[PDB]
Structure 1
């Protein structure tokens, strides 16, 4: 039986996309550009701050200095850190808390494998810190998803091999990263999005210890 579960944060444990979105929108408004709505934001999700800022400026054909670019990027980070101060246990996705408790009680290791620079803060605010055996630090990992590096680190950090682990993700790049680590992916979302070769559940309320065990037993 699997010895650990490696969690992404965004789309699995909670929604942090909402808060990047508002921070980009508050920046764009602040400098009198818009078009920064939830559709356009599809172009900003999981892309570099640099890339996000370019695309926003192109909305108004706006030109900036290097110092101005740097200040806008910082402003957005500031905005984001202000906006997540509201995060609470209320923001934990369905089934996630019960899953963590059942994993812990069965002595299965729990690790976070997230690019979030605020993972430890967010998990504290959601009252989930105690369940986690480790949080992979993205500042200490060489390559971002879909590279496997983050999931390897999260497994290693709790004393297991990725081939002893299940990884939970909602993104194409995240699923691929789990696969290349050697871990077994269980997706949350749409096969249209994440592939036909893996077990996908429609939402997080399907992520149960029972379900995870049945999938493990039925794997490759």
Structure 2
């Protein structure tokens, strides 16, 4: 039945979460706001704009202005890009090769608008992905945990929800995939408790991308 595999990017394809969590923590700290690196991890999947708005609501009891969102998004992007560029998540490439060999369509579904990562997908995973078979922050009105990005990915691939599988690392993205009615595999690549991923609606849970890759052939859909 399976036709397509819908990969989240940060913490699934790229090992970018230490950087994302560090940059969110530091930039918020610069603005007088306390957001731990673990709390930044818990926001993974959101668009940058949604993250900024929700942190302001939670910490200052008020919405971020459009100007605050833009300033903070840029400051965070610049700090992120100041680090040596993020490397592949171990297991991603090997899994992608397995997926492509069995005739499935790889897709990206991401809350990222980070062009330094998006423009590196082809060089890191050659021959796997296509811009018209991707959903990024540039495509959505509401991102994860709303199912809108995953629903859009189904449409882009001409797929029904039962013809896809989602691979996610973050509770909000797991929630989005599950709520789009798609079978969702959680991969626990960060410091969170796996139970948070299962609680978010993940149909299956693996401790790493490599362990998911090692087990893929024995998964049946």
Q: TM-score, normalised by structure 1?
A: 0.73
CA distance in 1, matches of 2:82, 2:88: 19
CA distance in 2, matches of 1:177, 1:154: 12
How many angstroms does 1:185 deviate by?
A: 1.0
Aligned position for 1:158: 157
Q: Is the 8 A contact 1:6 1:166 kept in 2?
A: yes
TM-superposed deviation, 1:121:
2.0
Q: Distance in 2 between matches of 1:34 and 1:143?
A: 24
User: Are positions 1:205 and 2:204 aligned together?
Assistant: no
Q: Distance in 2 between matches of 1:69 and 1:158?
A: 32
RMSD: 3.4
In the alignment, the residues of structure 2 paired with residue 41 and residue 53 of structure 1 have an alpha-carbon distance, to the nearest angstrom, of 13
Larger Rg: 1 or 2? Answer: 1
User: 1:101-157: CA deviations, max 9, x gaps?
Assistant: 1211222100001101125224245x2152114221332223211222211222332
Q: How does 1:24-173 map to 2 (within 5 A)?
A: 24-27=24-27, 38-39=37-38, 41=40, 45=44, 46=46, 48-52=51-55, 71-83=71-83, 86-87=84-85, 91-118=87-114, 119-124=117-122, 127-133=124-130, 134-173=133-172
Match of 1:177 in 2: 176
Bigger mean CA offset, 96-105 vs 127-136 = 127-136
The number of equivalent residue pairs is 204
List gaps (5 residues or longer) in structure 2: none
Q: Distance in 1 between matches of 2:196 and 2:39?
A: 19
Pairwise CA distance, 1:6: 0.3
For residue 14 of structure 2, what is the aligned residue in structure 1? 14
Structure 1 residues 37 and 66: alpha-carbon distance in aligned structure 2, compared to 1, 3 A threshold: same
